[PDB]
């Protein structure tokens, strides 16, 4: 189950900011 | 003692499951279908993130519903499914639970938006008339479908001024209208609660949204948000009084046999009505027009019965120009 | 039965105007100098927009202070001017009023940041050690300058992960420390209030910030924000008791002759302490370390006197690695 | 005039 990186419950990727 | 004067028996005629939302059974889609990218809003009952659909690669909004009665979720879910496709209606794209915690998130269509505080200033007399006419299609649609958005105000309307596109959002307070039902007055947002919620007239109707459209508009043309600035629900009515004047607050009260808690009576007091022109200042003068006033005036009445229907307002001389540009 | 155990005089020795902020006289700069671009946040007492400097073309944050005692602004402002330049301290670039509405705004330096909720998880054992060591330089500095930030919690610390840059922000609660002064306990934010604010020990000190750092850090390694989740002030203490155990809450109380309102006594009750390792789950195990635990443990004490100083903590075995990396 | 918020004018999105 390659899991890791998830808020509440969604995986999320990067600081894509602006 | 009230009943809707338009669209009252629609939920009557429709199949019970249409409005019997506790009866809904959420058909969850696939989370991993999305990835989260940036937070972007955080409401009382939810947290908003901009995310993405990994399959189609389209930007999307992920609303993560904070702790609340499951039935208060099946509501919005249902309401949203019911409206989906509606003109200017935010569009639910998929709904989702989470593996463990078990928290639901609504994944909406994305709107590029500019906070009204930053955007509105920027609009032109026509810009406004248009956006309101757009905002109106939303409300008339959804009312016609048995629903009351019970939360109308700027922050819940997304505008992509770039594409002159508009969406009405957050239906977490929208509810189904059933004739004669006694609803809850702890709705809308202070500034935009209509009189009826402020004097406890529980069997309210779509009319409520009209008053919020009222404040919202009033404040746009006058450049004075919030228009009515209560620090508290009691104060709100008060602040309303000092503009529509108490001689009407009373005629209203008697008509519906409503009784002000004394004290509220007190705080309110005697006040004459202040005519709309007394808000036309120099900067705002370009947006204020005999029509804008008639229209506003016909939105902001103590008597919800006497407010314009959505439909009726979509014909008001204010919108003639826009309406033209439409079927063109 | 308290007095600061570090930097207690930082204001005593200094010229009175250094800390006598009501005496401040704001020297307003040029509004016209900036333009607003997008709203970005909106706090209890303020509204934040990202703006821009038309002269130099640099991004900036415009914080428009909502209605509050002028003296509560001259504080922010003064504190801010006092800190300016301090390591990892947000930087006040200019303060502006407005020819018309007479409406102060604080125009800070811009930080590109990622909401903790989306950023933190992303971090590595090291990453954390680092940012807290960074966050530490901010607190030690400012404490050394006679100031208490009084409201430390993720949302008030900006991190430009792309540049491993960090800023501590919202000095709206920060206040000058004067030995023996009885301050106000309606500060910090629920979750991150220290015991002293929850049992009413008003002559608190910098120590308070240590406990916030305490929760903040505790939650980051254990991946459990908020660590102590009170629904209410009383509850908070309670939730703290169920982890540090009541046998300490008591020793504390007697030491400072403090008395629990009965009832709060009640709600708290008897509870044994839960040792830190009972929070090391599988998902968080990579961040938890015999050191992270010693360090956390030395931040989270009922007794503010026994918490680490900022300085002291900047030497804890946890940071050795990082502290290496500056020396090089 | 340059439309204005509280006190500052507002930058722009573009259109040419
Ligand atoms: N330098 C900055 N860069 C980016 N966002 C900021 C900055 N300063 C304040 N904000 C934000 O505005 C919010 C609260 O405003 P304030 O009450 O000034 O602390 C924070 O959580 C941030 O999202
Ligand atoms: N679909 C959406 N797209 C963009 N922003 C949204 C969406 N739904 C809610 N929000 C927002 O959440 C913030 C505050 O919520 P509200 O006051 O309901 O506008 C706004 O500044 C918007 O960023
Ligand atoms: Mg605050
Ligand atoms: Mg507080």
Please report the atom of ligand 2 found closest to the CA of residue B61. 1
Beta bridge partners of residue B105, listed in sequence order: B64, B96
Query: How far are the Cα atoms of B92, B95, C10 from residue B81, in angstroms, in the given order?
Result: 7, 10, 62
Does residue A9 belong to the interface with chain C, where contact is any CB pair within 8 Å? Answer: no
Q: What phi and psi, each to the nearest 5 degrees, are found at residue D10?
A: -120, 135
Q: Give the angle subtended at the CA of B50 by the CAs of B47 and B55, to the nearest 5°.
A: 125
Does residue D3 belong to the interface with chain C, where contact is any CB pair within 8 Å? Answer: no
Distance CA C202, CA B3 (A): 56
Q: Which residue of C lies nearest to D7 if distances are taken between CA atoms? A: C98
Chain centroid to Cα C147, Å, comes to 11
Q: Give the angle subtended at the CA of C54 by the CAs of C53 and C56, to the nearest 5°.
A: 70
Q: Are B64 and A8 in contact (CB under 8 A)?
A: yes
Pairing relationship of beta strands C92-96 and D4-5 according to DSSP bridges: unpaired
Q: Is the CB of C90 under 6 A from ligand 1?
A: yes
Best residue among B155, B167, B216 to mutate for probing ligand 2's pocket (most ligand atoms within 8 Å of CB) is B155
The CA radius of gyration of chain D, in Å to the nearest whole number, is 9
Query: How far are the Cα atoms of B141, C3, C265, C275 from residue C253, in angstroms, in the given order?
Result: 62, 16, 11, 21
Q: Which residue of A lies nearest to C115 if distances are taken between CA atoms? A: A15
State yes or no: B51 annotated in a binding site: no
* Strands annotated E in chain B: 34-41, 46-53, 59-65, 92-96, 105-109, 147-148, 157-160, 165-168, 175-176
Report the half-sphere exposure of B248 (CA within 13 A, side-chain side): 18
Entry resolution (Å): 3.2
Question: What topology is assigned to B2-19+111-328 in CATH?
Answer: Transferase(Phosphotransferase); domain 1 (1.10.510)
Distance CA B11, CA B21 (A): 12
State yes or no: C48 annotated in a binding site: yes
Q: Is the dihedral of CA B264, B266, B267, B268 positive or negative?
A: positive
A13: left (phi over 0), alpha (psi -120 to 50) or beta: alpha
Chain breaks in chain A (C to N over 2.5 A) after: none
Q: Are B87 and B137 in contact (CB under 8 A)?
A: yes
Chain D adjacent subunits, 3+ CB pairs under 8 A: B, C
Q: What is the DSSP string of C175-243?
A: EE--TT----SS-S-GGG--HHHHTT--S--THHHHHHHHHHHHHHHHT-SSSS--SSHHHHHHHHHHH
**Which residues of C are less than 8 Å from B118 in CB distance?**
36-39, 49
Q: Of the residues C98, C140, C151, C294, which is catalytic?
A: C151
Question: Which ligand lies nearest to the CA atom of residue C113 in the structure?
Answer: 1
Pairing relationship of beta strands C157-160 and C92-96 according to DSSP bridges: unpaired
Chains A and D touch (3+ CB pairs under 8 A): no
Q: DSSP 3-state assignment of B305? A: helix
Distance CA B193, CA B188 (A): 5
Structure solved using which method? X-ray
Beta bridge partners of residue B51, listed in sequence order: B36, B60
Both tokens of C137, joined, read 């330089």
Please report the atom of ligand 2 found closest to the CA of residue B111. 3
Catalytic site residue B151? yes
Chains B and D touch (3+ CB pairs under 8 A): yes
Does residue A16 belong to the interface with chain B, where contact is any CB pair within 8 Å? Answer: yes
DSSP state, residue B89: B
Q: What is the largest CA-CA distance in chain B?
A: 62
Question: Which ligand lies nearest to the CA atom of residue C115 in the structure?
Answer: 1
Is C36 within 8 Å of B115 when comparing Cβ atoms? Answer: no
**Which residues of B are less than 8 Å from D5 in CB distance?**
117-118, 121
Distance CA C20, CA C146 (A): 12
Taking the centre of ligand 4 as the mean of its atom positions, its distance from the CA of residue C83, in whole angstroms, is: 21
Where does chain C hold its CATH 1.10.510.10 domain(s)? 2-19+111-328
Q: Is the CB of C34 under 6 A from ligand 1?
A: no
Closest of B264, B282, B156, B258 to residue B203, by C-alpha: B258
What CATH class does C20-110 carry? alpha beta
Both tokens of B204, joined, read 């309210």
Distance CA C131, CA B24 (A): 46
State yes or no: B196 annotated in a binding site: no
Taking the centre of ligand 4 as the mean of its atom positions, its distance from the CA of residue C172, in whole angstroms, is: 10
State yes or no: B45 annotated in a binding site: yes
Where does chain C hold its CATH 3.30.200.20 domain(s)? 20-110
Distance CA B275, CA B267 (A): 22
Q: Which residue of C lies nearest to B119 if distances are taken between CA atoms? A: C38
Give the Cβ contact number of residue C259 at 10 Å.
12
Is B35 within 8 Å of A11 when comparing Cβ atoms? Answer: yes
Closest of B151, B46, B51, B163 to residue B112, by C-alpha: B163
- Which strand (E) or helix (H) includes residue D3? none
Q: Of the residues B9, B125, B127, B151, which is catalytic?
A: B151
Distance CA B268, CA B27 (A): 49
């Amino acid at each position: 189950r390659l899991y890791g990186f998830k808020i509440h419950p969604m995986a999320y990727q990067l600081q894509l900011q602006a | 003692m009230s009943k809707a004067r338009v669209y009252a028996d629609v939920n009557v005629l429709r199949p019970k499951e249409y409005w019997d939302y506790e009866a809904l059974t959420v058909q969850w889609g696939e989370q991993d279908d999305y990835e989260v990218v940036r937070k972007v809003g955080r409401g009382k009952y939810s947290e908003v993130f901009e995310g993405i659909n990994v399959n189609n690669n389209e930007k999307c909004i992920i609303k993560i519903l904070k702790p609340v009665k499951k039935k208060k979720i099946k509501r919005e879910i249902k309401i949203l499914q019911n409206l989906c496709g509606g003109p200017n209606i935010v569009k639910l794209l998929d709904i989702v639970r989470d593996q463990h915690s078990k928290t639901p998130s609504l994944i909406f269509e994305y709107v590029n938006n500019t906070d009204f505080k930053v955007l509105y200033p920027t609009l032109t007399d026509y810009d406004i008339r248009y956006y309101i006419y757009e905002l109106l299609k939303a409300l008339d649609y959804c009312h016609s479908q048995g629903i009351m958005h019970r939360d109308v105000k700027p922050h819940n309307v997304m505008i992509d001024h770039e594409l002159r596109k508009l969406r009405l959002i957050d239906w977490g307070l929208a509810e189904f209208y059933h004739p004669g039902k006694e609803y809850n007055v702890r709705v809308a947002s202070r500034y935009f609660k209509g009189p009826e919620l402020l004097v406890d007239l529980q069997d309210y109707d779509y009319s409520l949204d009209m008053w919020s459209l009222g404040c919202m508009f009033a404040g746009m043309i006058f450049r004075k948000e919030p228009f009515f600035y209560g620090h508290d629900n009691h104060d709100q009515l008060v602040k309303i009084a000092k503009v529509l004047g108490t001689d009407g607050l009373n005629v209203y009260l008697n008509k519906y046999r409503i009784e002000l808690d004394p004290q509220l009576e007190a705080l309110v007091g005697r006040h004459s009505r202040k005519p709309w022109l007394k808000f036309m200042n120099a900067d705002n003068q370009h947006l204020v027009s005999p029509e804008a006033i008639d229209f506003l005036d016909k939105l902001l009445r103590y008597d919800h019965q006497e407010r314009l229907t959505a439909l009726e307002a979509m014909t008001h001389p204010y919108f003639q120009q826009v309406r033209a540009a439409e079927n063109s």
